[PDB]
Amino acid sequence: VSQVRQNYHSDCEAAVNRMLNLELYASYTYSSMYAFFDRDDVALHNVAEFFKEHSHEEREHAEKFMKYQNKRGGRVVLQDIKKPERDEWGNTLEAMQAALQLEKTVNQALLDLHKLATDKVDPHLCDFLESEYLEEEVKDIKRIGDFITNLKRLGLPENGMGEYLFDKHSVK
Amino acid sequence: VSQVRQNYHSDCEAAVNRMLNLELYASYTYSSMYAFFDRDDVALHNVAEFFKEHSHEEREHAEKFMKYQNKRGGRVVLQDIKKPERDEWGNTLEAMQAALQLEKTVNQALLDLHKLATDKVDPHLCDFLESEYLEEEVKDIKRIGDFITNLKRLGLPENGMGEYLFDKHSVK
Amino acid sequence: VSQVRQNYHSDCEAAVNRMLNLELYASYTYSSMYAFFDRDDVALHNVAEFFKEHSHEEREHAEKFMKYQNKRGGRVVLQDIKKPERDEWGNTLEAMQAALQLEKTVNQALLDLHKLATDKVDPHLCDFLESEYLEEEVKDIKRIGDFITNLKRLGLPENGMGEYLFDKHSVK
Amino acid sequence: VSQVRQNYHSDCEAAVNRMLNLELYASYTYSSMYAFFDRDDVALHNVAEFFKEHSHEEREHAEKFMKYQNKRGGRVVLQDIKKPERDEWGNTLEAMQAALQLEKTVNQALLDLHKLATDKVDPHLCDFLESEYLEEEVKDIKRIGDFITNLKRLGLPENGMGEYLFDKHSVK
Numbered sequence: 302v303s304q305v306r307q308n309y310h311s312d313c314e315a316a317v318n319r320m321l322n323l324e325l326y327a328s329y330t331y332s333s334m335y336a337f338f339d340r341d342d343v344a345l346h347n348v349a350e351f352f353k354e355h356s357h358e359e360r361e362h363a364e365k366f367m368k369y370q371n372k373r374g375g376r377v378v379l380q381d382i383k384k385p386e387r388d389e390w391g392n393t394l395e396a397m398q399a400a401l402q403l404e405k406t407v408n409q410a411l412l413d414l415h416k417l418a419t420d421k422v423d424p425h426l427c428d429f430l431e432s433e434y435l436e437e438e439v440k441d442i443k444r445i446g447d448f449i450t451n452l453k454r455l456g457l458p459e460n461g462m463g464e465y466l467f468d469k470h471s472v473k
Numbered sequence: 474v475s476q477v478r479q480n481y482h483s484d485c486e487a488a489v490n491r492m493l494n495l496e497l498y499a500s501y502t503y504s505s506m507y508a509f510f511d512r513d514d515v516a517l518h519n520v521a522e523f524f525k526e527h528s529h530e531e532r533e534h535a536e537k538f539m540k541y542q543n544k545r546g547g548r549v550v551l552q553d554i555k556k557p558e559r560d561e562w563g564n565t566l567e568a569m570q571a572a573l574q575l576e577k578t579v580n581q582a583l584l585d586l587h588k589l590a591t592d593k594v595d596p597h598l599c600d601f602l603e604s605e606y607l608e609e610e611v612k613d614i615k616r617i618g619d620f621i622t623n624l625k626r627l628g629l630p631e632n633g634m635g636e637y638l639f640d641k642h643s644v645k
Numbered sequence: 646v647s648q649v650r651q652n653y654h655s656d657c658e659a660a661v662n663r664m665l666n667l668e669l670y671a672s673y674t675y676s677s678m679y680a681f682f683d684r685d686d687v688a689l690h691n692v693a694e695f696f697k698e699h700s701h702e703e704r705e706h707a708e709k710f711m712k713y714q715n716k717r718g719g720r721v722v723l724q725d726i727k728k729p730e731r732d733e734w735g736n737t738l739e740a741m742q743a744a745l746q747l748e749k750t751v752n753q754a755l756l757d758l759h760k761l762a763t764d765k766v767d768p769h770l771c772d773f774l775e776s777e778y779l780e781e782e783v784k785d786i787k788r789i790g791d792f793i794t795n796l797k798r799l800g801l802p803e804n805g806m807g808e809y810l811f812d813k814h815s816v817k
Numbered sequence: 818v819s820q821v822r823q824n825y826h827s828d829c830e831a832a833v834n835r836m837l838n839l840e841l842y843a844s845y846t847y848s849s850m851y852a853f854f855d856r857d858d859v860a861l862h863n864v865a866e867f868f869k870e871h872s873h874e875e876r877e878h879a880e881k882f883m884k885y886q887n888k889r890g891g892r893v894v895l896q897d898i899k900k901p902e903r904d905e906w907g908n909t910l911e912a913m914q915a916a917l918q919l920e921k922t923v924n925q926a927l928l929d930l931h932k933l934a935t936d937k938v939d940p941h942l943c944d945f946l947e948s949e950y951l952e953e954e955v956k957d958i959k960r961i962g963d964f965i966t967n968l969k970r971l972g973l974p975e976n977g978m979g980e981y982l983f984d985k986h987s988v989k
């Protein structure tokens with residue numbers, strides 16, 4: 302084993318690799334949403350840019366796991382980044398709903414990794430998750446839920462005027 | 474077809490999607506190189522950061538194709554991003570050799586897309602490739618080739634001192 | 646022939662004159678749109694100013710062809726600038742639709758001139774078109790298409806509220 | 818008991834005193850390394866200064882435990898600070914190896930104190946360790962491991978040139 306490795310369970314190392322992959326997967330999904338809202342027949346640029354920014358953030362989430370792995374003396378092992386579930390995302394409401402579910406998936410994985418770290422008595426990994434991931438997730442989930450509520454209030458999916466208004470006044 | 478689409482062949486649209494995927498693939502390979510050189514048993518941080526920067530640049534290459542696709546009225550279609558060919562990259566020389574070959578692969582794909590664009594009489598796509606991709610590729614290939622020459626001169630792979638010296642004085 | 650003229654085909658020279666005229670024609674059409682949206686019974690000033698700006702840009706497009714002609718040793722030959730197709734432009738959606746079609750007409754002419762330049766083996770004229778015209782056209786067409794999509798989403802032509810909202814939040 | 822003391826187990830109080838002593842011990846070891854590399858027959862001043870800085874940091878680690886003890890209403894109890902294990906440290910590689918082991922010892926003690934705090938249901942002490950100690954330890958261990966790898970690559974212990982080069986280009 303690595304000269305630096307101390308108190309780092311094989312199962313945690315593997316789970317960190319799987320989490321890295323899921324962050325990459327989330328990033329790629331958000332990229333797809335960006336491209337959809339930039340289509341000439343969709344054309345919601347502030348929405349598009351929201352998703353582009355999220356994609357970038359998710360990729361940074363992934364990079365932080367790679368650095369973490371090396372710091373602990375684990376070994377980064379990459380897998381394919383699966384394409385997103387959909388090719389097209391309907392409208393702002395459908396997309397935000399999909400983002401909520403994605404975030405909930407990511408959050409569940411983070412919470413599961415925290416339970417594993419707890420079980421293996423790895424306080425450093427617990428602290429990393431709590432200090433760099435769990436609160437950011439809660440905030441993001443809240444933001445997306447708030448957006449969904451407002452999209453529904455605006456009459457989505459049917460009310461195009463409402464969709465326009467959201468792009469112009471929310472997504473800031 | 475899209476209201477914006479004009480002089481944009483289906484075959485070019487598809488080839489742009491495939492190129493997008495290859496840029497993503499290149500990005501991911503460079504990320505793997507970064508992680509390898511950041512290992513505690515490798516520990517060539519300037520080398521690592523070179524590859525991290527390249528990864529970031531390649532992802533920007535990919536994003537520019539997505540924007541291009543939408544601007545022309547094509548439709549972005551994503552595929553899985555295949556994991557890199559290797560899990561570990563040997564040493565600085567082996568990695569740089571692999572990067573040269575990757576770049577040559579990417580460049581060939583760009584040149585093939587330019588030939589297709591030429592065949593389909595798409596000057597806008599030709600100009601995009603020439604103005605945003607082909608020269609950047611030539612420069613990168615030259616830089617990597619120069620590095621290889623210097624790594625060989627330094628005695629790689631056997632000469633660890635030489636490898637150290639490269640990390641400390643080249644990769645700027 | 647001119648002392649400066651080199652590799653400049655008579656057919657390209659003539660086509661440059663015709664293109665100059667079409668740019669002037671486009672400019673004049675946009676001026677008409679400006680005046681329509683400034684009417685007291687139309688009164689969409691941000692829309693009006695969008696079209697005024699476009700008119701100005703198109704006139705600059707024309708001037709650049711005159712300079713080009715002289716630089717190559719061709720001779721500028723002017724024709725009448727035909728009045729626009731319509732005297733009145735309906736509403737924002739109808740106008741944007743007409744602008745899309747105008748731009749597509751202009752773009753087609755530019756692409757046809759590029760094919761002619763290619764046929765006559767005139768790389769300088771190809772480069773001029775690619776570097777000064779073709780990308781600006783793609784961007785403009787995309788912008789107008791995006792606007793159309795949003796006008797439709799807003800309920801045009803029937804939804805006056807939607808038209809108002811567009812003038813106040815798009816056309817920036 | 819102290820008027821301030823709440824949820825602070827006698828066993829944790831004692832363990833904090835023992836940890837304080839170990840931080841002092843680590844500091845003193847690093848001072849010894851500093852003095853060794855400053856010898857006229859060793860003369861690796863950047864190496865020396867690395868160890869001097871570490872000594873200073875370790876003493877600050879100790880002071881933070883004294884403050885912690887008082888904040889919780891425990892009582893600081895000091896013991897002798899044992900002299901370092903060695904009087905002379907061989908060379909840069911041997912010293913870095915000894916530092917790695919020292920850090921691993923300190924880290925193990927911190928992790929053991931965290932387990933005790935967990936067992937006694939003391940979240941404040943857990944948080945203190947996680948927020949002020951555990952990550953700093955991981956970073957330091959990684960840094961030292963990286964140095965070891967590079968010293969080995971440089972040919973230590975035999976390659977004096979390599980040792981010189983390390984002092985002049987690493988230890989920044």
Ligand SMILES: [Cl-]
Pocket residue numbers: 306307308309310
């Ligand atoms: Cl371990």
Ligand SMILES: [Cl-]
Pocket residue numbers: 309310311312
């Ligand atoms: Cl294990």
Ligand SMILES: [Cl-]
Pocket residue numbers: 431432433434435436437438
């Ligand atoms: Cl967080």
Ligand SMILES: [Cl-]
Pocket residue numbers: 466810
């Ligand atoms: Cl409003």
Ligand SMILES: [Cl-]
Pocket residue numbers: 478479480481482
């Ligand atoms: Cl087409």
Ligand SMILES: [Cl-]
Pocket residue numbers: 481482483484
């Ligand atoms: Cl086609």
Ligand SMILES: [Cl-]
Pocket residue numbers: 603604605606607608609610
């Ligand atoms: Cl380029």
Ligand SMILES: [Cl-]
Pocket residue numbers: 638982
């Ligand atoms: Cl040197």
Ligand SMILES: [Cl-]
Pocket residue numbers: 650651652653654
């Ligand atoms: Cl001529």
Ligand SMILES: [Cl-]
Pocket residue numbers: 653654655656
């Ligand atoms: Cl001629």
Ligand SMILES: [Cl-]
Pocket residue numbers: 775776777778779780781782
């Ligand atoms: Cl242009």
Ligand SMILES: [Cl-]
Pocket residue numbers: 822823824825826
């Ligand atoms: Cl108590």
Ligand SMILES: [Cl-]
Pocket residue numbers: 825826827828
């Ligand atoms: Cl007690």
Ligand SMILES: [Cl-]
Pocket residue numbers: 947948949950951952953954
């Ligand atoms: Cl810390």
Ligand SMILES: [Co+2]
Pocket residue numbers: 342474475
């Ligand atoms: Co469509």
Ligand SMILES: [Co+2]
Pocket residue numbers: 346350
């Ligand atoms: Co933007």
